[PDB]
Amino acid sequence: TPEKEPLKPGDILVYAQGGGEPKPIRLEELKPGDPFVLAYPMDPKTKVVKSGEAKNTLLVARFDPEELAPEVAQHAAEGVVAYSAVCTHLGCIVSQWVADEEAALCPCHGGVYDLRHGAQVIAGPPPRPVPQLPVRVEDGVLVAAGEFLGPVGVQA
Amino acid sequence: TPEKEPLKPGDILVYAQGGGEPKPIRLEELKPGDPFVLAYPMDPKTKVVKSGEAKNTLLVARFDPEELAPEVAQHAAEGVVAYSAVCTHLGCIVSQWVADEEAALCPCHGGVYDLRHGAQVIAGPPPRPVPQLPVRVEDGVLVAAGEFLGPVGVQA
Ligand code: FES
Ligand code: FES
Ligand SMILES: [Ca+2]
Ligand SMILES: [Ca+2]
Numbered sequence: 001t002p003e004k005e006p007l008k009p010g011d012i013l014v015y016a017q018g019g020g021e022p023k024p025i026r027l028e029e030l031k032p033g034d035p036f037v038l039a040y041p042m043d044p045k046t047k048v049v050k051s052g053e054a055k056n057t058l059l060v061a062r063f064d065p066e067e068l069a070p071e072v073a074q075h076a077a078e079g080v081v082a083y084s085a086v087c088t089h090l091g092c093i094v095s096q097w098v099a100d101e102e103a104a105l106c107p108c109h110g111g112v113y114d115l116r117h118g119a120q121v122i123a124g125p126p127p128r129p130v131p132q133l134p135v136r137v138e139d140g141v142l143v144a145a146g147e148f149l150g151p152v153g154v155q156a
Numbered sequence: 157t158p159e160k161e162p163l164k165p166g167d168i169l170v171y172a173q174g175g176g177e178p179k180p181i182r183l184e185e186l187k188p189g190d191p192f193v194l195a196y197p198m199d200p201k202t203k204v205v206k207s208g209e210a211k212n213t214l215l216v217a218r219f220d221p222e223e224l225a226p227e228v229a230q231h232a233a234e235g236v237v238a239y240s241a242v243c244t245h246l247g248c249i250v251s252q253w254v255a256d257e258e259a260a261l262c263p264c265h266g267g268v269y270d271l272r273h274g275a276q277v278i279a280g281p282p283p284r285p286v287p288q289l290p291v292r293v294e295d296g297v298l299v300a301a302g303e304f305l306g307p308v309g310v311q312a
């Protein structure tokens with residue numbers, strides 16, 4: 001089905017949506033230092049939101065551009081970084097924010113991923129970082145700029 | 157399809173899940189005062205999580221019981237409240253936590269819902285509170301104790 005199609009580069013990132021038309025994530029809507037948003041890729045032609053495949057679940061956050069690791073910075077757009085939100089431990093959605101670390105927290109077993117340093121695991125049992133998705137801005141809007149730089153989710 | 161069935165009383169609450177087997181939310185995992193978790197209802201016997209219907213999207217948080225408004229506490233289980241996470245403004249998932257207010261925040265246009273006082277709108281444009289889901293504990297696991305108390309999401 002179109003809703004279960006994988007993320008492709010050029011997909012528009014949209015805020016996680018309940019019913020109705022989706023909202024593209026604009027750069028100007030993300031304030032540096034604010035908690036991440038959960039996001040999905042939307043086919044730029046068909047405008048189908050690929051929210052039916054859980055491997056397309058994203059977290060998106062704006063950091064101070066001079067706080068990002070050089071390796072993280074090269075895939076960021078104006079301090080904006082995106083990562084897979086599928087926990088690498090047992091596949092829970094990494095849905096919570098740790099304010100003092102500016103890290104992503106998994107509620108299931110306390111996995112914490114250090115986002116400014118490539119989502120390095122700094123707590124709990126994830127065996128590996130969630131992978132980063134390359135982002136770019138086009139006409140004010142966040143767009144997927146590449147494939148995930150890594151396998152998504154629980155890897156057998 | 158079964159992943160799209162509406163939420164029913166008796167459904168087990170599970171942590172939002174990528175691929176794979178879901179994790180029931182147990183009362184003991186929820187620390188009073190911690191940010192909410194995004195969740196879905198799961199059929200107790202078939203073990204089908206109803207996450208393909210976005211109107212089943214829940215937020216779950218544990219409060220100090222004596223800070224809940226009387227009406228809210230009537231449908232809480234040892235301080236744990238659940239609400240629909242579909243924004244009543246334009247349908248975005250209410251996915252963020254406001255730590256100083258203990259409030260759920262919609263990132264689309266800044267709707268903020270006062271969880272301890274029945275998800276009362278305290279910022280942004282939502283026309284009305286997200287509705288509460290009554291919850292109870294069954295063998296240490298969080299379960300739907302009734303139906304959503306009002307209509308879910310954007311009014312049609
Ligand atoms: S599934 Fe995320 S820490 Fe276990
Ligand atoms: S959709 Fe939540 S404030 Fe607009
Ligand atoms: Ca503008
Ligand atoms: Ca126990």
Ligand SMILES: [Pr+3]
Nearest residue numbers: 020021022047
């Ligand atoms: Pr449409």
Ligand SMILES: [Pr+3]
Nearest residue numbers: 033064067102
């Ligand atoms: Pr910082």
Ligand SMILES: [Pr+3]
Nearest residue numbers: 064065066067
């Ligand atoms: Pr700076």
Ligand SMILES: [Pr+3]
Nearest residue numbers: 070071072074
């Ligand atoms: Pr490089």
Ligand SMILES: [Pr+3]
Nearest residue numbers: 137138139140
């Ligand atoms: Pr253009």
Ligand SMILES: [Pr+3]
Nearest residue numbers: 292293294295
């Ligand atoms: Pr019983």
